[PDB]
Subunit: 235 residues, 4 copies
């Protein structure tokens, strides 16, 4: 028996990110060695960071890291993993038997399907779909996992047996970035009609991106607001 889930989760597992890190790093360029010591307050912090954001001076946002634990279907992990300045370590289906958790969209998700990303007329759907999707998914997931279990039972290599598993199978990974890589990622992986360049990601990676953005907002409140302020363009 399989488990169907529709939750996509991100947990902040570790970090070293602050708005002060950014101020210090940027100060060294005009201040020299005073940089590491100086008297910088609430209003000077806002001012400097907004300025770096508006000028796209991005390197001072690199002196940090945030590490997330992500649990998501493989098709969404494929989206996250396209971001080449991040580091990733993922559960391996060559090394382990895969758990029978599979992703299905929730009812309320399906009313926001993008038939051809970037085109307005292709957004829509309604919730007779959800039952049809649940019904199709259940049949395909069951068979795949049963054939999966069957080959493992004959002693077929796990890396071969998994060929039958759907891209909706859940995976778990660690994902580490600095703030600049995170802002570049948010620019592409959130849909924000406010933004200078509006992106059209699938909703499931956007779910990942929003949770990450919430955790990041707490660590770097001033950077986060400035990022939104300047049109969600990565410095």
């Amino acid at each position: 028996r399989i488990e169907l889930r529709s939750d996509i989760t991100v947990e902040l597992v570790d970090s070293s990110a602050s708005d002060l890190a950014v101020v210090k790093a940027a100060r060294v360029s005009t201040a020299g060695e005073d940089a590491n010591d100086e008297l910088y307050d609430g209003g000077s912090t806002r001012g400097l960071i907004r300025y770096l954001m508006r000028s796209r001076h991005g390197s001072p946002f690199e002196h940090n890291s945030m590490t997330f634990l992500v649990r998501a279907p493989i098709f969404t992990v494929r989206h996250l993993m396209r971001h080449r300045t991040w580091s990733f370590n993922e559960e391996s289906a060559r090394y382990r038997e895969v758990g029978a958790a599979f992703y299905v969209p929730d009812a309320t998700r399906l009313l926001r399907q993008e038939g051809k990303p970037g085109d307005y007329r292709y957004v829509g759907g309604s919730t007779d779909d959800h039952q049809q999707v649940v019904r199709s998914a259940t049949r395909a997931y069951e068979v795949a996992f049963e054939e999966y279990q069957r080959l493992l039972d004959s002693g077929i290599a796990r890396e071969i047996a998994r060929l039958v598993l759907p891209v909706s199978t859940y995976s778990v990974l660690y994902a580490t970035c600095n703030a600049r890589a995170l802002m570049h990622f948010l620019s592409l992986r959130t849909h924000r009609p406010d933004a200078a360049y509006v992106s059209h990601p699938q909703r499931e990676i956007e779910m990942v991106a929003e949770q990450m953005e919430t955790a990041w907002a707490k660590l770097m409140p001033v950077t986060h607001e400035a990022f939104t302020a300047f049109g969600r363009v990565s410095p």
Copy 2:
């Protein structure tokens, strides 16, 4: 549906030669002067053994790759490459699926355990038959979701990781060597890696094409233990 076991790589564009390496390396010792066969062979052997990899980066190779998604995930972990890949969010995907061929060992059960490696050919028929039921049902349902007006990006959730995809993949020679050290199983190498056979097929095809472009670099690569400089 179609079942297939080809995994193909074609070189589609390049600007890559051994001489491009020699010139790049020679600005250092010679300056402007830098812009035979034995000084080329010599210089390249030295850069390889000293691990001066920067001269090997002044070049590009582009490949067109046809492989199932699980192997494409392997390829796309190499972050210094450039990729563009067929999208199931935009396209209705083709009913082509990978199954291993007859000569594939079917029993590495934990890679790096050359105690967990083996196989037979009654395993073959089992794999094919069993994958076939999985793929058939997945595709039928993928079609029924499309036919009900479900968006492509959602319909595809039911497709296995053995679905064929296709992409352009571009690297310089230094990134390729790094890729080859990880993505071929070569007990003769200084550091032995244990890649899945399917990505290794990709890798062998790329190495073969690259040997035609840069045969002296390819020889030095192997001579010094298949360690990327």
Copy 3:
């Protein structure tokens, strides 16, 4: 016996860069295998490249390379080597006796000096500045080069003798990028009031950038034109 020059030179030595490669790379997404054997006409090329440029879809612009031979002052080479997606190989002063060639800015250049980059009110300059710079530079360079040779004559290692040499000493290097990295470089290393983000690079690095742009314009005229139509923002 020193030589003063004020020419910063870029030569394209090799490339494999075209607009058509960009189209193929984008078409694989929507057309699959067929993209590799498709024929593309002028208007479909233009429409597609302008679409990617304005949408900031940048990956299709990476399947190429350009290799430049660059001769420039150290201080300008440092600007150029800040760009981490490039490949560089540079003449070594640890290995080679350095040539007596040093950069001075020419008279036209000095009219457009940047006192506080980004601040337009420290932009400017006089006509007699050229003579004061030349008289000042020539004295300092002569002494550095003379001490350099003295150190070399006393058997001091080249790696140590060169500490007396100025940031205006000429170096030579190969610099290799793809068009996307070149574009991000041009958005930062050229000053353009038309641009969506006006940058304030030292004129010396900008001279490097303009010549790269000219050579690249010839290889990928469609992309070039599109990059400029949409405000010099790197996809």
Copy 4:
């Protein structure tokens, strides 16, 4: 003007421990359950050695270390060739340069290299130190004197600096993860015992040594493995 021979590195921030390695590696083999349970020094060391010996590099990337570095420009150029790092450096286009310049100390000059990579080109002596100090003093004094005359003439900071030598001190922040740091140590330390002998100049190697010490304090199991296996980055 002030002549110095110190090259300093200070750790100003980090999030790095051997623990972030074990967790990142454990996800692959034990899934979700690798964030959340049984941890053991022996098994932690055996896993880190195994990743190191096998060059499984990626689990060593979930961390960061930020160094504040003060070093002459010619050394900064060596450090900044490592493109996986992030840097922010004092700008001479924005700032009047301080007249601090590097001269090698007396012991260092006894080493000097070549031609780097040839054993028989290493040498020096202690009236050579006084040559170096005297030539340097003459060059730097004139450079700084011209620098000032140009600034006094209202010539722009960015142009005036053309006269200053590559021995001018600069200050920067440098952030990397432990995988990038290992690669940098492999190339920027000279260790006849390593699987690959590298021949960096002494000054960047003085930067490297201090970074290694600071890192080893944070990740001693990783550092012991790095060294045990020939100082090859995973």
